[PDB]
Enzyme design. Sequence first.
Site, PDB file in Angstrom:
ATOM      1  N   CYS A   1      10.708   9.408   3.617  1.00 12.19           N
ATOM      2  CA  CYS A   1      10.295   8.643   2.331  1.00 12.19           C
ATOM      3  C   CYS A   1      10.900   9.284   1.170  1.00 12.19           C
ATOM      4  CB  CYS A   1       8.814   8.703   2.012  1.00 12.19           C
ATOM      5  SG  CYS A   1       7.911   7.714   3.495  1.00 12.19           S
TER       6      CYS A   1
ATOM      7  N   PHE B   1       2.547   1.295   5.105  1.00 18.23           N
ATOM      8  CA  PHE B   1       4.050   0.923   5.147  1.00 18.23           C
ATOM      9  C   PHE B   1       4.264  -0.513   5.509  1.00 18.23           C
ATOM     10  CE2 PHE B   1       3.726   5.334   7.441  1.00 18.23           C
ATOM     11  CZ  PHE B   1       4.298   5.942   6.529  1.00 18.23           C
TER      12      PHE B   1
ATOM     13  N   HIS C   1       7.909   7.923  -5.890  1.00 16.99           N
ATOM     14  CA  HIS C   1       7.688   7.278  -4.596  1.00 16.99           C
ATOM     15  C   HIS C   1       6.314   7.102  -4.122  1.00 16.99           C
ATOM     16  CE1 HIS C   1       8.173   6.235  -0.860  1.00 16.99           C
ATOM     17  NE2 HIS C   1       7.351   7.031  -0.197  1.00 16.99           N
TER      18      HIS C   1
ATOM     19  N   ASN D   1       4.348   0.611   0.806  1.00 22.42           N
ATOM     20  CA  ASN D   1       5.265   1.956   0.856  1.00 22.42           C
ATOM     21  C   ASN D   1       6.486   1.426   1.827  1.00 22.42           C
ATOM     22  OD1 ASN D   1       6.484   4.477   1.560  1.00 22.42           O
ATOM     23  ND2 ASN D   1       4.718   5.626   1.965  1.00 22.42           N
TER      24      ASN D   1
HETATM   25  C1  LIG Z   1      -4.998   6.428   2.415  1.00 19.40           C
HETATM   26  C2  LIG Z   1      -5.613   6.552   0.883  1.00 19.40           C
HETATM   27  C3  LIG Z   1      -5.212   5.411   0.053  1.00 19.40           C
HETATM   28  C4  LIG Z   1      -7.247   6.569   1.093  1.00 19.40           C
HETATM   29  O1  LIG Z   1      -7.860   6.377  -0.050  1.00 19.40           O
HETATM   30  P1  LIG Z   1      -8.808   7.157  -0.817  1.00 19.40           P
HETATM   31  O2  LIG Z   1     -10.121   6.623  -1.339  1.00 19.40           O
HETATM   32  O3  LIG Z   1      -8.309   8.329  -1.586  1.00 19.40           O
HETATM   33  O4  LIG Z   1      -9.446   8.022   0.364  1.00 19.40           O
HETATM   34  P2  LIG Z   1     -10.960   8.099   1.007  1.00 19.40           P
HETATM   35  O5  LIG Z   1     -11.429   9.300   0.997  1.00 19.40           O
HETATM   36  O6  LIG Z   1     -11.820   6.981   0.518  1.00 19.40           O
HETATM   37  O7  LIG Z   1     -10.287   7.591   2.313  1.00 19.40           O
HETATM   38  C5  LIG Z   1     -10.724   6.394   3.010  1.00 19.40           C
HETATM   39  C6  LIG Z   1     -10.737   6.887   4.375  1.00 19.40           C
HETATM   40  O8  LIG Z   1      -9.326   7.398   4.989  1.00 19.40           O
HETATM   41  C7  LIG Z   1      -9.386   8.583   5.542  1.00 19.40           C
HETATM   42  N1  LIG Z   1      -8.014   9.163   5.099  1.00 19.40           N
HETATM   43  C8  LIG Z   1      -7.413   9.432   4.087  1.00 19.40           C
HETATM   44  N2  LIG Z   1      -6.164  10.144   4.273  1.00 19.40           N
HETATM   45  C9  LIG Z   1      -6.187  10.286   5.672  1.00 19.40           C
HETATM   46  C10 LIG Z   1      -5.184  11.102   6.310  1.00 19.40           C
HETATM   47  N3  LIG Z   1      -4.146  11.748   6.011  1.00 19.40           N
HETATM   48  N4  LIG Z   1      -5.511  11.238   7.683  1.00 19.40           N
HETATM   49  C11 LIG Z   1      -6.719  10.579   8.134  1.00 19.40           C
HETATM   50  N5  LIG Z   1      -7.691   9.996   7.408  1.00 19.40           N
HETATM   51  C12 LIG Z   1      -7.253   9.845   6.067  1.00 19.40           C
HETATM   52  C13 LIG Z   1     -10.629   9.218   5.013  1.00 19.40           C
HETATM   53  O9  LIG Z   1     -10.981  10.391   5.657  1.00 19.40           O
HETATM   54  C14 LIG Z   1     -11.623   8.098   4.945  1.00 19.40           C
HETATM   55  O10 LIG Z   1     -12.264   7.875   5.970  1.00 19.40           O
HETATM   56  P3  LIG Z   1     -13.782   7.388   5.811  1.00 19.40           P
HETATM   57  O11 LIG Z   1     -13.936   6.426   4.796  1.00 19.40           O
HETATM   58  O12 LIG Z   1     -14.205   7.303   6.898  1.00 19.40           O
HETATM   59  O13 LIG Z   1     -14.479   8.860   5.196  1.00 19.40           O
HETATM   60  C15 LIG Z   1      -5.341   7.603   0.293  1.00 19.40           C
HETATM   61  O14 LIG Z   1      -6.039   9.098   0.527  1.00 19.40           O
HETATM   62  C16 LIG Z   1      -3.842   8.085  -0.061  1.00 19.40           C
HETATM   63  O15 LIG Z   1      -3.035   7.572  -0.647  1.00 19.40           O
HETATM   64  N6  LIG Z   1      -3.406   9.278   0.450  1.00 19.40           N
HETATM   65  C17 LIG Z   1      -1.949   9.611   0.449  1.00 19.40           C
HETATM   66  C18 LIG Z   1      -1.391   9.089   1.716  1.00 19.40           C
HETATM   67  C19 LIG Z   1       0.040   9.921   1.935  1.00 19.40           C
HETATM   68  O16 LIG Z   1       0.041  10.987   2.319  1.00 19.40           O
HETATM   69  N7  LIG Z   1       1.153   9.200   1.818  1.00 19.40           N
HETATM   70  C20 LIG Z   1       2.376   9.611   2.400  1.00 19.40           C
HETATM   71  C21 LIG Z   1       2.769   8.900   3.572  1.00 19.40           C
HETATM   72  S1  LIG Z   1       4.307   9.458   4.260  1.00 19.40           S
HETATM   73  O1  LIG Z   2       6.519   6.765  10.980  1.00 17.86           O
HETATM   74  C1  LIG Z   2       7.149   6.456   9.978  1.00 17.86           C
HETATM   75  C2  LIG Z   2       7.479   5.089   9.484  1.00 17.86           C
HETATM   76  C3  LIG Z   2       8.765   5.179   8.486  1.00 17.86           C
HETATM   77  C4  LIG Z   2       9.141   3.577   7.874  1.00 17.86           C
HETATM   78  C5  LIG Z   2       8.206   3.264   6.808  1.00 17.86           C
HETATM   79  C6  LIG Z   2       8.498   1.994   6.432  1.00 17.86           C
HETATM   80  C7  LIG Z   2       9.469   1.049   6.954  1.00 17.86           C
HETATM   81  O2  LIG Z   2       9.530  -0.217   6.573  1.00 17.86           O
HETATM   82  C8  LIG Z   2       9.963   1.752   8.132  1.00 17.86           C
HETATM   83  C9  LIG Z   2       9.697   2.843   8.776  1.00 17.86           C
HETATM   84  O3  LIG Z   2       8.320   5.871   7.352  1.00 17.86           O
HETATM   85  C10 LIG Z   2       7.908   7.183   7.608  1.00 17.86           C
HETATM   86  C11 LIG Z   2       8.224   8.026   6.694  1.00 17.86           C
HETATM   87  C12 LIG Z   2       7.690   9.227   6.985  1.00 17.86           C
HETATM   88  O4  LIG Z   2       8.025  10.202   5.756  1.00 17.86           O
HETATM   89  C13 LIG Z   2       7.450   9.895   7.935  1.00 17.86           C
HETATM   90  C14 LIG Z   2       7.144   8.950   8.954  1.00 17.86           C
HETATM   91  O5  LIG Z   2       6.447   9.308  10.213  1.00 17.86           O
HETATM   92  C15 LIG Z   2       7.514   7.346   8.928  1.00 17.86           C
END
Ligand SMILES: CC(C)(COP(=O)(O)OP(=O)(O)OC[C@H]1O[C@@H](n2cnc3c(N)ncnc32)[C@H](O)[C@@H]1OP(=O)(O)O)[C@@H](O)C(=O)NCCC(=O)NCCS
Ligand SMILES: O=C1C[C@@H](c2ccc(O)cc2)Oc2cc(O)cc(O)c21
Lengths: 389, 389
Positions: free
Chosen positions: B165, B216, B303, B336
Amino acid sequence: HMVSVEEIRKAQRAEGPATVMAIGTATPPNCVDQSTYPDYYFRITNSEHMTELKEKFKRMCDKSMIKKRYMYLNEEILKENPSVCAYMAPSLDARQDMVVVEVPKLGKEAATKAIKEWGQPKSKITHLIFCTTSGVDMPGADYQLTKLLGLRPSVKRYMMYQQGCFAGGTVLRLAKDLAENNKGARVLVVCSEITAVTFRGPTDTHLDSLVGQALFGDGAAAVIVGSDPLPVEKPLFQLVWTAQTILPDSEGAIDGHLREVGLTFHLLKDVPGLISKNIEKALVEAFQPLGISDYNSIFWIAHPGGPAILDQVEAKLGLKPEKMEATRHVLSEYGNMSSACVLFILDQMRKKSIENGLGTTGEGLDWGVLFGFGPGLTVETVVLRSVTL
Amino acid sequence: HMVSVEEIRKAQRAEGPATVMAIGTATPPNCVDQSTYPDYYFRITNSEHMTELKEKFKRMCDKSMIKKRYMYLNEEILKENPSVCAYMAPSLDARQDMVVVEVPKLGKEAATKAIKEWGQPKSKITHLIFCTTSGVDMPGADYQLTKLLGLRPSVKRYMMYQQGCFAGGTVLRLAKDLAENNKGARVLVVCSEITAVTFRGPTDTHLDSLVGQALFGDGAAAVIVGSDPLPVEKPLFQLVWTAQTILPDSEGAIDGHLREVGLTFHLLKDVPGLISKNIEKALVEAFQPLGISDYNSIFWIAHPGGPAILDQVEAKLGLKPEKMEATRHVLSEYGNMSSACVLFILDQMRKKSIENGLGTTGEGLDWGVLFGFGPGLTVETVVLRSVTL
Ligand SMILES: CC(C)(COP(=O)(O)OP(=O)(O)OC[C@H]1O[C@@H](n2cnc3c(N)ncnc32)[C@H](O)[C@@H]1OP(=O)(O)O)[C@@H](O)C(=O)NCCC(=O)NCCS
Ligand SMILES: O=C1C[C@@H](c2ccc(O)cc2)Oc2cc(O)cc(O)c21
Ligand SMILES: CC(C)(COP(=O)(O)OP(=O)(O)OC[C@H]1O[C@@H](n2cnc3c(N)ncnc32)[C@H](O)[C@@H]1OP(=O)(O)O)[C@@H](O)C(=O)NCCC(=O)NCCS
Ligand SMILES: O=C1C[C@@H](c2ccc(O)cc2)Oc2cc(O)cc(O)c21
């Protein structure tokens, strides 16, 4: 004054040509004799009953002009992972488990040797290019190598996955722009290739897969590239000009697919003819602007995709037999190590130049060419200048 | 007269800063409403019995601040490919067969739009960067795009596979050096992301995988980058300065492995905290040399890994709520889209600046920052300058 983007640009760019300042190489310890490979390969794949196919494989190995290869894979690992010995069994997880670890480990060995030759602190490495055709992961082999070497966390990384055999040229074409556009930049370049992703049992339906089993070997090579060398740095080569092209009428000549059975290899018999048909046009693009038309007056580094490519280029242009010596030496001692091969050849040419007391790192000549050949069919051209010894 | 490497270098290099001259975007046609997604997702993966896990996933989808996403995958394709609907059935070959075709095809749509905005002949494209986290192949998506658009066969390609990402920052860091170091160079940059490689069924054993299923989405974005704009070209932004770093104590925060079951996603709850704890250090390194310490005085592209990253950054720095508007707009309308997201956000910022009659493509401000976040944990920083409208 107010800082302007134009003032920032003038202060942040380098002045001189990208310069190779170190080359290091590394192989897995398991040395596999080519003279006995058909017996070894048909035995560890439990394929002894395919007697006609084995005769065909023996002719492939006998004509390969390879004496030995180094391989991460050994008899113990193959007995532990029999899905890898099948021609076409689901085996990618077994192969990934090997190469996601071994690729950066072998790259670390090569990188340490390049850093040792460069003689500067590894804190001064600003950019890292990591190149492989052997597995993928997130975070990538670039991240793993940064952790293994203890580079600065702010090293600027370029992770070049699933590139293929032309990418020894590609990483030099990239390093050139990184070094020349960035004052102070010192680029570590690592190509690391492990055949655990492509190794597979024999079949009589896809004889091109068998050609792969006769040619591909393991290795890693590293270079340091920078502009404006310090007096304590020791230039080996300058990078002058680069080109990448797709050959006409070459669709599907070299293909590779990452599947549940690992990395599959598709290879048309037309590859040597396609390369030799088009190589003079690549040389004219590179050397006409320099006033060079005698291709026996430059030093050569050619990706040794197999001996038929080298033989047909030599015959087409009328290269004297000396021109391909360094290239053939690496093919003989290591086989085709995909992207790493042309970096081993650059090292071999410097080494033989020193051993024979020649006047430059380019066999006593001033100008040189490096070619990578791979999927496309892609040709990478790098024009090189030697340094005086 | 004998040409020297120093004379070639002087004639070869560009003069001015790398300039974004066009942005185009594309999404698959299947629009997926976030408010109904938990019922769709639990049904199509045969998981309606998991009533507690579905309530958890509703809570994730409701908190995601995503309204809709675009997905290559639809009910018809999923019924044709039950292996993709399991949590962990062998499915890589079916997923590769989808994304090896669809990633370059969606890239072409975006690229065609960038080229149309640029208003120059596609024969003037010298360099192509193709970036994806969705599948791998040889030759790569860069080769396929070169063929689909009819680019010159001698286009210099940079195939960026399995990046994740942060790579929308990476492709701009790479394009900057290609454009600046090469007189006349015009760089086409394409990020194309298709979730067919990561889609999978739910399990209470991997809740982080479920987060991925909520966030995603699919999309592709393209930019043209060049130095020394012609009078008939129309600059949008200048690329001023770049950095990449790995955050301390972030090991394993975001991981992804390519396996026989497709691309697996691992995600720690630590990610928003790690980013917000470290973002000011990244801003000081970028902006203290420019005399900037008020982060409300610059335009923002971040991002949108999830809303929690944006909320915790905003709170840590005391950003006004308006600073993240363009970023949250894209998160809301697209989810995302991995590497492509920050390029959609740059387009959205230009589009809103035009709609609202602001003085510059950067919401009326001169300086801007673009951040990519992804595996490592890696932070990419790009300092931008807007252009007057
Ligand atoms: C996912 C997200 C939208 C949830 O919103 P939030 O309200 O802040 O979090 P909440 O505490 O209400 O979470 C909702 C649920 O998701 C779970 N959750 C959130 N992040 C999690 C993670 N990384 N792994 C596992 N569970 C997760 C919480 O434990 C919760 O479960 P519950 O309702 O059963 O307790 C938010 O945590 C977020 O944007 N996280 C960042 C995601 C990230 O790291 N992005 C990078 C992607 S590569
Ligand atoms: O597992 C995935 C899916 C990938 C992805 C996102 C959007 C899409 O359209 C296609 C692929 O993005 C990621 C990005 C990360 O940093 C780590 C990950 O593990 C992943
Ligand atoms: C493989 C190679 C070393 C064989 O040496 P050679 O000088 O061609 O010897 P031969 O012509 O007798 O070829 C050996 C056998 O391999 C077969 N062979 C060669 N290339 C083949 C290919 N691409 N697909 C299938 N079979 C092939 C020949 O048909 C022949 O079979 P036979 O003895 O049963 O008739 C040689 O053909 C070579 O170097 N080829 C280039 C390989 C290449 O394309 N490299 C790029 C890899 S990415
Ligand atoms: O399948 C492979 C193996 C790969 C490779 C060689 C040596 C090594 O050590 C590791 C991997 O090189 C290739 C190069 C190609 O152009 C196409 C291919 O299909 C392959």
